[PDB]
């Protein structure tokens, strides 16, 4: 019916799929020193959502349910509900609920609360540490550190907004988060399930291309760096073309608009990520108004113009 | 190959107590979550009850929650759910299931009915 194509959009007019801010960059690097497997922003350029990817952006590093003191402290645990309130599943076929954090960190945002008997609200400061053991969100439990022990309350709706990411100052700095490493969904010696699978350039000679932004700190020296392998707009683009893959390469070429010159081209995998021909760590240079373009299904084998 | 297979159902009466157990083998079963799923008459099935490995996250139904807990035991590879104050709405096939990397296992079922 369709052909396949991307979406028409500027890296700035676009969104990161793993936390809900704008793309600022791309930027390339090796990555065969470590494990590349995020779950959100993962999508097959057919349309299939993948890991704990959903579509829009402000539900991601969102959690919501009811909360319960723990006591001596000033922390929550939170039972998960779906987002329309009801029951969360644990025996779905995804590693977590959709939009769950995908890597390990301190996450800083606001606990917001209403009594629905009399419509008075609250919001609190809270800090969600997705390394706890206390940190299981495929079965619905998760902890938040807040700046109250006695005011929220038991049974009413409650949910976490995130806004950035916290580091220990006395610390090493930039120390974490680590975006690269997965939380434990189901909390301690528990394998994660379902996940979406790693992914690494296999043709000599490229690398990843990785969609970035600078995630807000709010405490401390923090890795703001922020990689996701697709837009949160491509996830969304690609789940309503549904256009069938017609190869397992996609040709893109980064364009600008203004004079028609191809700037770089690059191989989007049917499984849903990008890879360039170049070595070495580079942040690309790009005109504002470039944006991508499909211009041939191609085989794996295809040779990139270095970019 | 993996095998669950569940077993205490019974006909009982509204208040009492039951206990399903569920027999795993052909996997590791330690360092999975393990779950409890349920089908009554003219429905599909519903999530009862979860537990992580080592058993310090569980979590249940809000329609089960206080009356019902989940254990297991890994050495022996045996999953439990203690069911206490049976209702009538209970009334189901309880079946055991797991998830190991992208696929997902369930046993045949084992039969409740709390009537008076």
């Known amino acids: 019916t369709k052909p396949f194509s991307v979406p028409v959009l500027t890296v700035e007019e676009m969104t990161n799929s793993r936390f809900p801010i704008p793309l600022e960059k791309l930027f390339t690097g090796p990555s065969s020193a470590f494990v590349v497997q995020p779950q959100n922003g993962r999508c097959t350029t057919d349309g299939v959502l993948l890991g704990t990817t959903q579509l829009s952006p402000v539900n991601i590093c969102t959690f919501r349910g009811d909360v319960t003191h723990i006591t001596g402290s000033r922390n929550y645990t939170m039972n998960l509900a779906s987002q329309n309130w009801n029951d969360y599943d644990p025996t779905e076929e995804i590693p977590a609920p959709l939009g769950t954090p995908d890597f390990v960190g301190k996450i800083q945002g606001v606990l917001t609360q209403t009594t629905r008997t009399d419509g008075s609200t609250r919001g609190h400061k809270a800090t969600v540490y997705t390394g706890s053991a206390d940190f299981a969100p495929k079965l619905g439990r998760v902890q938040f550190e807040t700046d109250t022990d006695r005011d929220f309350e038991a049974n009413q709706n409650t949910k976490f907004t995130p806004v950035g990411v916290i580091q220990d100052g006395g610390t090493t700095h930039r120390n974490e988060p680590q975006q690269w490493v997965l939380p434990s969904y189901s909390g301690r010696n528990t394998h994660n399930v379902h996940l979406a699978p790693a992914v690494a350039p296999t043709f000599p000679g490229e690398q990843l291309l990785f969609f970035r932004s600078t995630m807000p700190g709010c405490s401390g020296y923090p890795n703001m760096d922020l990689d996701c392998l697709l837009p949160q707009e491509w996830v969304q683009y690609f789940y309503q073309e549904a256009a069938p893959a017609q190869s397992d390469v996609a040709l893109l070429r980064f364009v600008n608009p203004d004079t028609g010159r191809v700037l770089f081209e690059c191989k989007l995998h049917k499984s849903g990520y990008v890879t360039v021909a170049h070595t070495g760590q580079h942040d690309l240079v790009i005109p504002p108004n470039g944006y991508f373009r499909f211009d041939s299904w191609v085989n794996q084998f295809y040779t990139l113009a270095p970019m | 190959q993996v095998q669950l297979q569940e077993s205490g159902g019974g006909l009982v009466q509204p208040g009492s107590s039951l206990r399903l157990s569920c027999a795993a083998s052909?996997?590791?079963?330690?360092?999975?979550?393990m779950h409890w799923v349920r089908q009554a008459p003219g429905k599909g099935p519903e999530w009862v009850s979860s537990?992580?490995?080592?058993?310090?996250?569980?979590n249940y139904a809000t329609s089960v929650k206080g009356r019902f807990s989940i254990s297991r035991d890994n050495p022996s590879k045996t999953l439990y759910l203690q069911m206490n104050s049976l209702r009538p709405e209970d009334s189901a096939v309880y079946y055991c299931?797991?998830?190991?990397?992208?696929?997902?296992?369930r046993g045949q079922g084992t039969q409740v009915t709390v009537s008076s």
């Open positions: 052909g996997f590791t079963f330690g360092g999975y979550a």
């Open positions: 299931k797991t998830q190991l990397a992208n696929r997902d296992y």
């Open positions: 537990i992580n490995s080592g058993g310090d996250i569980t």
